[PDB]
Design a protein around this ligand. Structure first.
Ligand code: LOC
Length: 127
């Protein structure tokens, strides 16, 4: 039924950086994933209330989604690119854990992960 508070996206106590790698993650990596036909389930936190999933947040204790990642990039939440890459991986891994191979949702996540891994590959050298 109830949703947990979303992952943190604002914290003036957390140190942050604006870097070319983080700029790339927003302007190239998130932009490309966001517009994908399979993005929609990943654009906001899993809504246990709306989707009637009483068990989701019992199984998934570190939830993540592109809506949260988007806020984090736009509001300069991160110290480094690795932090952001970890959020994407957490999001994919959550999906694989909660669901089973060959589920539509898993196929959709797998397709997004493929685009992601490719963009991550051309990540600029840090300045
Ligand atoms: C009643 O409708 C929906 C209900 C759910 C989901 C969903 O998006 C595909 C829905 O469509 C709006 C769903 C959503 C997101 C997930 O993670 C991003 C997930 O792991 C898992 C899911 C769903 N599990 C699947 C698709 O096997 C269960 C909850």
């Amino acid at each position: 039924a109830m949703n947990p508070p979303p992952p943190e996206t604002s914290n003036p106590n957390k140190p942050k950086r604006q870097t070319n790698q983080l700029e790339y993650l927003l302007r190239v990596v998130l932009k490309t994933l966001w517009k994908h036909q399979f993005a929609w389930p990943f654009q906001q936190p899993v809504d246990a209330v709306k989707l009637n999933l009483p068990d989701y947040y019992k199984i998934i204790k570190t939830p993540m989604d592109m809506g949260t990642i988007k806020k984090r990039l736009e509001d300069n939440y991160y110290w480094n690119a690795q932090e952001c890459i970890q959020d994407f991986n957490t999001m994919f891994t959550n999906c694989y854990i909660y669901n089973k191979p060959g589920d539509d949702i898993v196929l959709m996540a797998e397709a997004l992960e493929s685009l992601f891994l490719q963009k991550i590959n051309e990540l600029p050298t840090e300045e």
